[PDB]
């Protein structure tokens, strides 16, 4: 068996039971296989979280590199939002990819970016703490919309706090939280970028 | 003698031994040498048995929620975030056991000041909303990869590279802040706009 198998249906299982739900010995016998056998492909849950991660945003994370001359506001925007759109194509999937550093195979990926990065002002620490707040920002955002659904005497303003929730689906908490975080990184990088 | 606070005591220190995936009903039960069903009669379901671990967190840990006399609304956030991050590091998966969850009744007036607070200082309750719920996300995610991380966790490119040796610097608290900041100075520069 090779992974495309192994990871498709995993990614099927995932659906089906959920992140929790999901162990390695119900993957052996979805793919009507022995233990040992999978054992090497995936040894443990931990890995199995990891390829799926990996193989959930090489098949729907569709943004990674800015464009020639794309703003990095833009830059930033986009990646948060394929992420976003990545994460949730399956159940759990913000779940899924907590914990999951980059694979090797995309470290000239992160380099280009973090490069991209510096190269428009940013120091590369300044750099890799927006990216890392917009990643962050929208694994909280996933997970808080991925999550409350299943989940399922009030002062005047919370009522009506809640009220607006509930009219959302969560994507313009997203999109709102986004923006004022690359509105943020606007504001500071011009103000550093006068020294 | 078996009562709720016991209940949340005892899945606290489960939770703190297993993760929120180890924490079940059944174990928990075990845990605290009961059959399952007796837990009901002092915790609804599990889900209430999470809403109640993740108030009680906040319940011991949060020290900050209110803003203290004159201070300003982003020193209000900051504050807030800052607290509500170190209360849910203090347990393994207490972000986990926030996700999904809504305002207890027993946090009802601490939340109407908060909402208040940010509508006094310009804020309309939409945005003051969403500023108050962007924070919770960026500090949902950003300690749920930091536990994570740590559960689990050669020659490179020099951005990565130091990338890297600027992530492993600390627990990922100057990241954090400085997606805090960020996102404050991204509130500030909305309302001003008005």
Redesign the interface.
């Known amino acids: 068996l090779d992974k495309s198998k192994v990871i498709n249906s995993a990614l099927e299982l995932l659906n089906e039971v959920g992140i929790?739900g999901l162990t390695t010995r119900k993957l052996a016998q979805k793919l009507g296989v022995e233990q040992p056998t999978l054992y090497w492909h995936v040894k443990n849950k931990?890995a199995l979280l990891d390829a799926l991660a990996v193989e959930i945003l090489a098949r729907h994370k569709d943004y990674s590199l800015p464009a020639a001359g794309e703003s990095w506001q833009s830059f930033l925007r986009n990646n948060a939002m394929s992420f976003r759109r990545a994460l949730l194509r399956y159940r759990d999937g913000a779940?899924v990819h907590?914990?999951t550093?980059p694979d090797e195979k995309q470290?000239?990926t992160?380099?280009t970016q973090?490069?991209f990065m510096?190269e428009n002002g940013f120091s590369?620490?300044?750099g890799?703490?927006?990216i890392?707040?917009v990643?962050?920002?929208?694994?909280?955002?996933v997970?808080?919309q991925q999550?409350?659904?299943?989940?399922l005497?009030?002062?005047?303003?919370?009522r009506?706090?809640?009220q607006?929730?509930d009219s959302d689906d969560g994507e313009?908490?997203?999109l709102?939280?986004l923006?004022?975080?690359?509105?943020?990184?606007?504001?500071?990088l011009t103000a550093l970028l006068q020294i």
């Open positions: 929790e931990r779940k907590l914990g550093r470290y000239d992160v380099e973090l490069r510096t590369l620490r300044d890799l703490y927006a890392l707040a990643i962050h920002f929208t694994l909280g955002a997970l808080e999550e409350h659904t299943a989940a005497n009030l002062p005047p303003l919370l009506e706090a809640l607006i929730m313009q908490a997203f709102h939280g923006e004022s975080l690359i509105r943020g990184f606007e504001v500071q």
